[PDB]
Amino acid sequence: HTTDTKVFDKVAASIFDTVAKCGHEASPSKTMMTPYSVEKTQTHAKQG
Amino acid sequence: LREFFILCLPHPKKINNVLRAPYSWFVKMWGVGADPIVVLQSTAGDDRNSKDVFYDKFRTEPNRYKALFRSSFYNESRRMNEEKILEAVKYSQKLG
Amino acid sequence: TATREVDFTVPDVQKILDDIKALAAEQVYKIVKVPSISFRHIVMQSRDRV
Amino acid sequence: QEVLTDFRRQDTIWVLALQLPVNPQVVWDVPRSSIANLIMNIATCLPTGE
Amino acid sequence: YIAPNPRISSITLTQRITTTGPFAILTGSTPTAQQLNDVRKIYLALMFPG
Numbered sequence A: 001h002t003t004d005t006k007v008f009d010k011v012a013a014s015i016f017d018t019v020a021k022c023g024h025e026a027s028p029s030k031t032m033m034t035p036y037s038v039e040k041t042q043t044h045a046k047q048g
Numbered sequence B: 001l002r003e004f005f006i007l008c009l010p011h012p013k014k015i016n017n018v019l020r021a022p023y024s025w026f027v028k029m030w031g032v033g034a035d036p037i038v039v040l041q042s043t044a045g046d047d048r049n050s051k052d053v054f055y056d057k058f059r060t061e062p063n064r065y066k067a068l069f070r071s072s073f074y075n076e077s078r079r080m081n082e083e084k085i086l087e088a089v090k091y092s093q094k095l096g
Numbered sequence C: 001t002a003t004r005e006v007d008f009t010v011p012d013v014q015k016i017l018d019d020i021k022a023l024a025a026e027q028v029y030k031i032v033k034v035p036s037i038s039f040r041h042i043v044m045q046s047r048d049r050v
Numbered sequence D: 001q002e003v004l005t006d007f008r009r010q011d012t013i014w015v016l017a018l019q020l021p022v023n024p025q026v027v028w029d030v031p032r033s034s035i036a037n038l039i040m041n042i043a044t045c046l047p048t049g050e
Numbered sequence E: 001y002i003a004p005n006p007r008i009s010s011i012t013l014t015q016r017i018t019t020t021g022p023f024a025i026l027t028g029s030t031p032t033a034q035q036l037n038d039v040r041k042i043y044l045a046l047m048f049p050g
Helices: A005-021 B002-007 B012-018 B020-027 B074-095 C013-023 D036-045 E035-046
Strands: A037-039 A044-046 B036-043 B054-062
Touching (some): B012 B020
8 A cells, every 4th residue: 555665664574574473484585575576486587 | 698607617416506595586676666667567456466468568667666666675675685696606616 | 669658547446545544644733731931031131131 | 443442532633634434426537437446446355266 | 848638538438449530530639750850830820911
């Protein structure tokens, strides 16, 4: 919804702290949150 | 290829395994963030998991997220992916 | 030939509703303890008049 | 209505910045604005179904 | 020369459902190097009537 960098990192840190509270470990260098790029089970797609 | 074959030479099965994650991430963040963005238009059902997609022409739109990428997330992700290369190439400097 | 021209024929409506929502968070007033000073006095080296 | 519910509701000054019974004549007075009250009616209330 | 606004012949409603113009073929067309000199023969005739 909101395009603001100061409030997006509050969202992204809350994701990685929730997955760390769930016992598991996520990696920031592999987890992607990006609009125009979708990958799903070794199937890559970019900009349609 | 020639710069990558030299790098993955002195230990192929460990260096190629660790270079895989920065290579796949680099393509998957290539086009996003540029100010004019060209897409391929398509429309389907109102579900996001609709498979009945038909396609249209190309068009170039302005990017609504052109300022979001100067955040603390995307600057840390590209800096960590550089270190995974830099830990890998410095391992090959010592071996060969 | 269908790339050189920048599209502006579809206005984004998801952006235009997501800025009205941020416009509701504007705060016009201001809760303050004392009011601002509205009369100040200058001393013209006199013990009787300012 | 949880904000009007806590036990400090007896001594609380409520400051409201926008009245809710919106007089809808000020929306339909915009000149030749009938399309803009249809793209806005779609993007605010239309459900997504299968 | 100024082409008209591209939103005159097409209104988009919900996601990609668009109103189509009747002359959508003649609008989306490019003048060649010969038919552009004939446009400068029409506007030369309008600014000098008789």
